């Protein structure tokens, strides 16, 4: 009689009908990625539209069950996502024009290219063409030509398409009773209905801004060290208290500094840990690479992989006849069908990536018993965070020596680990400032605090203050830097990468306390320890059915994000960088510019 019984009935029949259409929609995309054919391209659109229109048809009946009469927390969470109308709230024109802007901006990104200034005939596309050249390019002009010329025909041309994306998406948030479109993404962390665990959407701006203050002393030292090694190349453009060029970050957008690890090696007289030459002599293939990782999850207590998982895996690309995307991805369809599509070579990274790609599959097995709408991570940062903790355990010399990759007589000391922390710091400490910088800028533009003319004026003004990077060539409001980015042009969440660093480290410190490991954190290894797996498995099966604030307390015992695990794991590196920076100036100034003298 009560609306509760009617709501639970609508939710029971929704999981069955949605599981069949969702599985066929994901299955169609699998055959399209594994094999490029005219039949798979159409099946992805038909199966994709059938499932896309399914939620639109169910959303009409979901708004007829108010959440005020529902006293069940698990019931409101399932209807919380269905209550949203998506693009239905937008006008007929604004709703159809939105997909045209997303498809137009996404097409220019893949079709965009920059012709070689020295070779006008040869014109290389950004990916891989422009992303690979900028990685190993040490030239100042060669890197500036592709970096400066890209945003000229892209950043400038995407400005009118980006303006519509800002106005169109705002109309959707306002129709949803949201302060703005920026608050739309913060809704993933929204927590309500539980006394004391409530997490407001606006509290994210204060947490990300409060936690970033503690990372400054660690990043300032890491930035001063990188500027000292590269200061001998161009002392005029690189000031001691200034900032590093924007095109010298090692790649197009300067997201990860790992490419600079070669020249930033503190000690070049000592060997480095690599499994490439060790795996070659062992004569291992893609078939035994995943098998070795499957035994790791069993040592911690996690169930093994189903027979269909290993049988349906795609270990390589059979030439150009049948082509697939080598980009590692973990595909979860449904009905217990788990698969991974990746191109498997013999490298030290593929071994670490195998644990990451398998972490997503292993993570999907815990909450697989939850309802369709209840199957998901507690937030957008837990997806890749659970997979990083698995890779961090394999990179430790203790895990490598266990399976026999690294020689048992390999000497492990400060000089050996100090070089390892620097490699992980560039990929970790390097993305944090860039993530908080770009993510915070989008929130200000969407909120309306930055006029359209100040988009670029505030972009570089906040860049030197956050990441300490200055533009070699000044730009006007015509250019759009985020327009060229992959996540910004594809309408994907860019904040999930910032929180992933804080979440992956919290679990690393908590899981090692259960296994009773002593010494530095980077020396911890969760293998052979079945006590840490039982504690992490509890939250793995919860998913988003429970507030992420509550599930996070059962693991690390914290009700919010904390930077403490970031300082301890990087503590040994901070102590060494502090001494090497005594001869230099720690930090940078925002009053220095390469074109302003």
């Amino acid at each position: 009689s009560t609306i509760e019984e009617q709501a639970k009935t609508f939710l029971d029949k929704f999981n069955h009908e949605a599981e069949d259409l969702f599985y066929q929609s994901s299955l169609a995309s699998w055959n399209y990625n594994t094999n490029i054919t005219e039949e798979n391209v159409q099946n992805m659109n038909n199966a994709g539209d059938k499932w896309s229109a399914f939620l639109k048809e169910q959303s009409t009946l979901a708004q007829m069950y108010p959440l005020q009469e529902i006293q069940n927390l698990t019931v409101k969470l399932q209807l919380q996502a269905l209550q949203q109308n998506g693009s239905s709230v937008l006008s007929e024109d604004k709703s159809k024009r939105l997909n045209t802007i997303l498809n137009t901006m996404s097409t220019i990104y893949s079709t965009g290219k920059v012709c070689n200034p020295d070779n006008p005939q040869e014109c290389l596309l950004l990916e891989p063409g422009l992303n690979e050249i900028m990685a190993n390019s040490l030239d100042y002009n060669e890197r500036l030509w592709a970096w400066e010329s890209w945003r000229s025909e892209v950043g400038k041309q995407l400005r009118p398409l980006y303006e519509e994306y800002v106005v169109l998406k705002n109309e959707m948030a306002r129709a949803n009773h949201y302060e703005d479109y920026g608050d739309y993404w913060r809704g993933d962390y929204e927590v309500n209905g539980v006394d004391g665990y409530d997490y407001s959407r606006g509290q994210l701006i204060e947490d990300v801004e409060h936690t970033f203050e503690e990372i400054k002393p660690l990043y300032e030292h890491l930035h001063a060290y990188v500027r000292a090694k590269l200061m001998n190349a161009y002392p005029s453009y690189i000031s001691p208290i200034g900032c590093l060029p924007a095109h010298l970050l090692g790649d197009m957008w300067g997201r990860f500094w790992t490419n600079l690890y070669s020249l930033t090696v503190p000690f070049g007289q000592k060997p480095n840990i690599d499994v490439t030459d060790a795996m070659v002599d062992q004569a291992w293939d893609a078939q035994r690479i995943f098998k070795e990782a499957e035994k790791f999850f069993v040592s911690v207590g996690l169930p093994n992989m189903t027979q269909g998982f290993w049988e349906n895996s795609m270990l390589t690309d059979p030439g150009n006849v049948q082509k697939a995307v080598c980009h590692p991805t973990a595909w979860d369809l449904g009905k217990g069908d788990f698969r991974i599509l990746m191109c498997t070579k013999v490298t030290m990274d593929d071994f670490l990536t195998a644990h990451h790609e398998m972490g997503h599959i292993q993570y999907d097995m815990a909450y697989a018993a939850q309802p369709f709408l209840l199957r998901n991570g507690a937030n957008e940062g837990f997806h890749e965070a659970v997979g990083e903790i698995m890779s961090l355990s394999a990179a430790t010399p203790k895990h490598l020596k266990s399976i026999g990759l690294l020689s048992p007589d390999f000497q492990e000391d400060n000089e050996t680990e100090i070089n390892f922390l620097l490699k992980q710091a560039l990929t970790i400490v390097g993305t944090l400032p860039f993530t908080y910088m770009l993510e915070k800028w989008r929130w200000m533009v969407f909120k309306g605090e930055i006029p359209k003319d100040q988009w670029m004026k505030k972009w570089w003004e906040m860049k030197r203050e956050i990441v300490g990077v200055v533009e070699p060539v000044p730009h006007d409001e015509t250019y759009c830097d985020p327009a060229s980015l992959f996540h910004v042009s594809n309408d994907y969440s860019f904040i999930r990468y910032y929180t992933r660093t804080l979440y992956q480290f919290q679990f690393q410190e908590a899981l090692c306390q259960a296994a009773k490991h002593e010494g530095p954190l980077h020396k911890c290894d969760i293998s052979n320890s079945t006590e840490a797996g039982q504690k992490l498995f509890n939250m793995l099966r919860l998913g988003k059915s429970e507030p992420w604030t509550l599930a996070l307390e059962n693991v690390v015992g914290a009700k919010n994000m904390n930077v403490r695990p970031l300082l301890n794991y990087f503590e040994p590196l901070f102590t060494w960088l502090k001494d090497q920076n005594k001869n230099s100036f720690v930090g940078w100034s925002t009053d220095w510019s390469p074109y302003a003298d």
Binding site: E5, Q6, T9, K13, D20, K335, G336
Partner: protein
């Protein structure tokens, strides 16, 4: 049964009753297809708000997980009534001397 029942594209021939006004009694079989009424809103056999179709088809494909793979179950009900007994176990019939 994944090697027989499950086929490419899915097999909807095997369905089930998702909703019922109550719980079935022991050894009871009801094939009634009458629409299920969740609330007090009249249905009259026309699908709509608070009106659903109870029978649902089992998705069957060879790519499904082993847990959800269809299993053919044969349930033998042993009941001893007042009537004489007939069915018995096998025999022996050893050698003769």
């Amino acid at each position: 049964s994944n090697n027989l029942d499950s086929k490419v594209g899915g097999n909807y021939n095997y369905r089930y009753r998702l909703f019922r006004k109550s719980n079935l009694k022991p050894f009871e079989r009801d094939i009634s297809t009458e629409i299920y009424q969740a609330g007090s809103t009249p249905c009259n056999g026309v699908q709509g708000f608070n009106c659903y179709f109870p029978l649902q088809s089992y998705g069957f494909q060879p790519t499904n997980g082993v847990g959800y793979q269809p299993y053919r179950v044969v349930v033998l009900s042993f009941e001893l009534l007042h009537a004489p007994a007939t069915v018995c176990g096998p025999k022996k019939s050893t050698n003769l001397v």
